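User: Can you help me understand a structure? I only have the sequence.
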Amino acid sequence: GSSGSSGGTVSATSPNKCKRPMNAFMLFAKKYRVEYTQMYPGKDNRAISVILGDRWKKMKNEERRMYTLEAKALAEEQKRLNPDCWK
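Assistant: Let's start by predicting it. Here is the structure, written out as tokens:
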């Protein structure tokens, strides 16, 4: 089951513990989350993210494929595991 059509006059709030899928970038910023958390302890979380994106923009087409295809499987599987999705 699927659910979560377009919104209505909704702005950017950036909630937490949401119930969204794991897109390509998501797998990157995540898989590389702690990677920068220990490499850049002097920086803040808000910075760790900004830097992460930069790498995704500098990377190549194949360098991102690892997350593109990978995330895809998760984007489809997650739907199978959650057949009861009305929200």
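Now, to help you interpret it: The radius of gyration is 15 Å. Helices lie at 24-31, 33-39, 45-58, 61-81. Let me know which part you'd like to focus on.
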